[PDB]
């Protein structure tokens, strides 16, 4: 879950900042840079007392740990 | 001087020009129904209409 | 001079890279004006 969440938001960030005129031009030559399908991750990110076998699991905390590791990896790779 | 409605010489600066355009063309055509606000793209995008 | 520099600096806009991306998927350059032979 953490892996695909980070991938989804990285792709959305990259797609938001791409030149719009470039997308138009590419579509006009049949080389469309496809948009990323929308997805519903908001409800999962807000979970904080998931119940399993008598334990209360804070999903938000674990997702944050994995995503922060991924962000650090991305910055390191860029540099 | 170009951040004010008019310059020190009483002439239209780019603040006024762009404000006038954004209200009297973009949002007008949005209210007509030829444009829509996509929160996905964080922009306004032409709808695929006849016009 | 400012007109010339604007023409030079608008050739770096992303809108001019459509052909390259289309070629890369399906299948002049800046800095050449400053090469003094």
| Contacts with C, A 9-28, CB within 8 Å | 18-19, 21-22, 25-26, 28
DSSP reduced 3-state for B12: strand
Header resolution in angstroms: 3.0
Structure tokens at A21: 């005129």
How far is it, in rounded angstroms, from Cα A5 to Cα C35? 47
Structure tokens at C2: 């400012």
Helix (H) or strand (E) holding A14: helix A2-16
| Contacts with B, A 5-64, CB within 8 Å | 16, 20, 38
How far is it, in rounded angstroms, from Cα A31 to Cα C20? 10
Solved using: cryo-EM
DSSP reduced 3-state for A29: coil
Chain C nearest-CA distance from A39, in A, is 26
Chain C nearest-CA distance from A37, in A, is 20
Residue B47 in contact with residue B35, Cβ under 8 Å? Answer: yes
Helix (H) or strand (E) holding A50: strand A50-52
Helix (H) or strand (E) holding B43: strand B43-46
Say what angle helices C18-26 and A20-28 make with each other, to 10 degrees.
Answer: 50
């Amino acid at each position: 879950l953490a892996d695909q969440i980070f991938a989804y938001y990285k792709v959305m960030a990259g797609s938001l900042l791409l030149d719009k005129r470039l997308r138009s031009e590419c579509k006009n030559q049949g080389a469309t840079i496809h948009l990323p399908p929308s997805n519903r991750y908001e409800t999962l990110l807000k979970q904080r007392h998931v119940q399993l076998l008598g334990r209360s699991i804070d999903l938000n905390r674990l997702i944050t740990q994995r995503v922060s590791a991924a962000m650090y990896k991305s910055l390191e790779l860029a540099i | 001087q170009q951040t004010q409605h008019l310059d020190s010489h009483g002439e239209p600066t780019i603040t006024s020009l762009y404000t006038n355009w954004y209200l009297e063309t973009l949002l007008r055509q949005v209210s007509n129904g030829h444009i829509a606000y996509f929160p996905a793209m964080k922009a306004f995008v032409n709808l695929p209409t006849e016009n | 001079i400012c007109t010339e520099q604007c023409t030079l600096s608008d050739q770096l806009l992303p809108k001019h890279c459509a052909k390259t991306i289309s070629q890369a998927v399906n299948k002049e350059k800046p800095g050449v004006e400053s090469m003094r032979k």
